[model samples]
Target: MPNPVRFVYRVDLRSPEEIFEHGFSTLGDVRNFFEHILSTNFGRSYFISTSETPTAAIRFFGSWLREYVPEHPRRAYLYEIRADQHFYNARATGENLLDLMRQRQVVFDSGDREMAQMGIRALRTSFAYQREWFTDGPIAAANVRSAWLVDAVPVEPGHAHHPAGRVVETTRINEPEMHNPHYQELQTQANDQPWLPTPGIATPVHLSIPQAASVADVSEGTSASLSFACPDWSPPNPLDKCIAEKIDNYNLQSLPQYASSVKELEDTPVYLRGIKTQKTFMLQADPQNNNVFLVEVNSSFPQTIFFWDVYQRICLKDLTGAQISLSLTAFTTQYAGQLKVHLSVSAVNAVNQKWKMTPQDIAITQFRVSSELLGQTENGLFWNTKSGGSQHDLYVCPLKNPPSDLEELQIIVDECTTHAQFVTMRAASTFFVDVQLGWYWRGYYYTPQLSGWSYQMKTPDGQIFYDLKTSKIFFVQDNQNVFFLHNKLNKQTGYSWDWVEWLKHDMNEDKDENFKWYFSRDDLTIPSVEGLNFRHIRCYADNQQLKVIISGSRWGGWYSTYDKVESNVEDKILVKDGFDRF
Candidate 1:
């Protein structure tokens, strides 16, 4: 449906030489040759079969021919020759030529299987057919008479030289119907190699020729015709030229009409949600830009978050000539009845031509939100607001009573703005949501690089140990809440202390800051920390073994006391290794 224009054309072949000269070596060659010619001449086209054409002429003519023609009649048979010609002609010319040949018939020598088979071969090969705008057309009619008789078959041994066979009218069978085994075998010769039109072809049931000259004169080159029909509505050319010329060279002022035409043919900003699961959204790291990422999450992981690139972050663009340069980053479906999202905006911008703005300067002003249950829209639930200037806040919008299929979510921010150049610079991010089917982790935390930063945690199901030379500490999901253990040495006491912090893992904007987890060497009890004066605290995990190394000491000396401990659901106990104590 995207292409509305259609084209049909035909080439008439007057002889076997003409078919060969046209570069049609085989059935495949015929199709391929025509395909290139159509593309070069017609811009581009999606050629369909002439067989698909539905018309009253086709039905009526096919019926009449099958009913009138008897099986293998004698005496120079040519009853349906004209009918066959006009039948194909009607399709090619978009005119019913069937009525022109309805009352006609021809005679052929039934015993002359050579001529019969020749006619059969020609009819089967020369059918006409039709493709789309910028695509392709009809199977040229082959000049069977001269092509088959003059150059192909030989003169009969007992007959006159250059014998064209014999022509004598009235219905004559020469012999009655007989059970000739060779006849049956010949009849069963499979015509599996059907000659297809680079799109459709056909033939006379029977015909007779008295001389080679008559064979050449019968219909060769005389009845051949060609026709082309172009609708006024068809574009001067498919938008291919415009796309190649205008897209990369877009300028609002230069060639405005050309740009507009190209945009007209261009599709709308493809909503990421619609294409979800339809393409690879794998994250590709930007080698040149440290802050940039080519992000596409697996759509099959239906609950995964989507990111929008803005300010030329990834150089992606929309139809409006605006750069998609920000990232929605974290879009977790729901936590304790509220949607939790993390929006990460790039500092790069067209106005500044540089990365400048801080995260605090960005704010969400509106949301064009919608929900889906099994991909069916449950309600518009679209919301917008002119207020709210906070960026770090976990923005929340209420949903009505949950629907049964409300396992999916789709979100598109209508307007998010950053005040710049004395105006609100607006942008939007699209979200794909499937009803949150099951509990998934919504809280994520990461610490800055730290040495000897090893972490070990276990679910009731199993334990996971991570040891590395440089690492970050963080709490992922632990039941309904998050627990953080900060292990930073106390500056006042000159001793490291182990402390814990907890936050209800719910999407609460006011309490969002209360759950803020941080790692700092300046702090006293931050486990995910590089405490003051510490050097080369390395941790490594290999072959399921966890090792921690404290090579360079803090506070001008090696801290002789370092501790390692483990705890069960019931109680915590210290390790017996003395060096494990701090």
Candidate 2:
């Protein structure tokens, strides 16, 4: 802040920045596009998502400026934009719309919207709006608005002595800042030698670092206690290795029209390489495939999933339109012998819902819903006993027949909704399921969503429990994956769902006496930096560190930021591993 009136300093992001007329697209007939959206580099600007600590991201943006918009006088001129355009902020509200409809879908499906039903409302999981923010990478955004030039102060990527030095003044790289007064400030200077904030490379880091090659399994194994620990967590690079040594890794209806787009079909996966920001991520697949990984092409365009071969760094498969007879044909192409392949798909055929576990040579079980009870997976099938109704009965259908022991299984889903349940362990018949249920209608009806779920596990025989440490799982990516306060891990843990009581000492969250090791480390809230109130965006934590997506508003536009919990003494438990390890 400025000390005196005219000399007093303040941050003013209230007005429009630069509005320029650009003639874009060197592709000739489309050259008019140059002026169409020049600032965001032909509709792609890293600024779509904001960050208080965006040095590295800005560095990449700088590299892009020189690439296409080459820092020239008027050609690559600095273009300013008001954040008002929907194009600039990457609303990511599509999921919101999805959940909104799902809200009514369940209501109509069950015909049970009576206030008499206490928990009747919309759901976050039904839509997964905010959760998806952290699901992939920072969303990439493009602008269909105005841009112009403005002369502002020159900023060296050097550190300055000031409270806000961390904002723009202090920099360890060479990229110009991505905000107003800075985004294209160096353009004119580039007439001779353009300035780019590109960063220098450092030692390579794997998506999954080799475990502490030397952390002995246990300090004391007298009682055979357990825990999970990782040195760091981050979104893996597109070509980076899988989340493990090298292995591992929505929506329904009408048999659901498998939607497609021209831009999506033609566009390159350049943005979706699974980088931390602007679309991408590698998740170990459900049901586990040998070295099979997943890449989520999440960007301004509709999202798509691609199967990747981790060991060879190959793209194993992709699905679209009606690969109907071959949903898994391409999937099982390369390594059919390594592991089993199955894709869970859903549909509503004029009546109710249906789920099919795909990638099967033949629908080993191409089944349908009768009462439309709804369905897939685990050792057997699990679906709500009643459509639009709560409570589910789980069963493991046989290859050609049914087993008595499997037919009579019941699970009364409370607040925690089931993500996935299956058996991949030692104990016979034992399986695990992680739960997270969220969001809903808040208009005419009040369907609350904030702080809406929990994380728990059930030991086959000893089913139904939340008395575990993960009860504080605030960020849920899916059923099996979650960000929760881990009891034995000693802090808020990034949990990748899956375990063998032997390989990881997991699989008994509720049964583990080690449960005593984890608890609520703190009562907290992620306060917004600029906006009056903060909003939860996403969770990008791997099994290593905790990184969340968050945002706030300024000048009527929402900006993005990160939730990287650094380990320090003030928050010991949360930072047990320290740095990215935590």
Candidate 3:
């Protein structure tokens, strides 16, 4: 069956960096968007019924205003806004003006008490004034409602009785840095309660229902405050907290709409690629030389999908890049041991196909001090001249004793090469890999500059990188064909009713739809680093035998630096192999 086309309105707020660069309206635009998302976007919606009575409409206005824009000044300022304007705008533009106004309350505080009161009066009067069009007279149809599919967000848990209670949990990849102020507030009140732990809270609590919708009041540090309808549950649901966060940046309805568009029209199965930033190796090959080759591996983008399973022991993959030269011994370590690895090459020219490895071209790899050379094997030739034998292959091995260390080992291959190649001794051999095996897949790259909703990591490395002004990365995987409504709809059209419904009010948050994109490695099938872009990058290791890859054209020339040479070259050889059979 054909899916029903749902409508959505999105107010994109530029990022803080972009806010300074690109001109955007009040912070209210961003806040309103988030509010929209809170109440919609997950097949769940938040709704509130209202009567045509001006007073009741005023109550609804007060709910959002008190939480977002408190300190009402008059009897009826907001209550007096032209119902026709709101009605027409909601109908015409396919948006809810009241919801927008409330969202703005979360963005900007209503400093003027009189102005806030006036806004409420306006909302009340507008609904009253527009009642005739909605239902013959002061119809119940004027109630606010919203709905959308959820993506990067989950659906609201169904509510039992109001007093059934709700639970809230906040998680960070890294847990030592900080805690939420509100959670702390609840903690203090609980007085050494077990449910609400010192570091975090993991239990439900009681909450009161809204006597009336509250408006936001301004504070010294912030411009706005947000008020929410209290479900009968005493404690708030962490899901609600997440919902609020999402609502603060995007309209829930916009998510599924955009997600569906991508799934239906633009999505296709294609090769995926990635890289790492620790060792920045460049790739430059001249087909003319038949021997021409250059590949710089950056560790920031992973070419393969990796997951460390607890039950399965650790696995290691050997890299292919070796050279037989006098410099090999000078680079040998104090440990003074050698390694044998199985390596493959993707070469052109005389080579028949990609990932081709030959027995004669292969050799038992070893890394030892050339000066202390002992056994004189026929293939063991350590001469460091202008010959192309110094280049070597690389490997990444994670130590089992101390799970903290990651090794970037290099090995010289005894294979022939078309020409001299800058070997990229990548630790992880699963190159050009991008895979999500389980639930961590969401295919939209959330540009904070465009969405106002950006995510940050809490891991130690993640925290440091985030502080370094790094661009956040999100794996986009929503396959639910969705699109945008570029043109504005006018209220005069016959579509007014649906449009009003489409431009949902903040109360209908339960019926919204939600979507998920995978990123966690347990969900991957085939992974490759084929289609990925990069920005800032760095690496970490316990030893110095590591070749690092960073951003391009900044440090050295096209070829940054490498510990090993490409395997396709005749002077190199590789031996060890494990999970990365490819």
Instruction: Please give, for residues 380-499, the per-residue lDDT of candidate 3 as tens digits.
Output: 111111223323232212222211222322222222211101110111111111111011112422111112122321111100101000111112111111111111223333541111
Off by over 4 Å in 3: 1-280, 283-395, 400-582
**Root-mean-square deviation of Cα positions for candidate 2 versus the true structure, in angstroms:** 27.9
Candidate 1 to truth, TM: 0.18
Question: TM-score for model 2?
Answer: 0.18
Ranked by lDDT, top first = 1, 2, 3
Worst 10 residues of 3 by lDDT: 461-470
Please give the CA lDDT of all the candidate structures: 0.19, 0.18, 0.18
Top candidate when judged by lDDT against the true structure? 1
lDDT value for model 3: 0.18
For model 1, the stretches where C-alpha displacement exceeds 4 angstroms are 1-43, 47-325, 333-337, 344-367, 371-375, 378-399, 402-582
Per-candidate TM-score against the hidden true structure? 0.18, 0.18, 0.15
lDDT of 2 by residue, 1-582 (tens): 111001001111122232121211111122111111111112222222221111111111111011122143211122222222112111122222222222232223221223201111111111111111110112111221222222211122122111111111111221253433332321110011101112242112111111111110110000000000110112334212111111110111111111111011211121111111222222222222222223332311222222211000112133223211011111212321111223322110111111222111121111111111222122223221222322122222322333322221211111121101110000011111121211111111111122322112211111111211121222222223333333222234354311111011232243332221111112223221221111222211222222221222211111111223522101111111100000
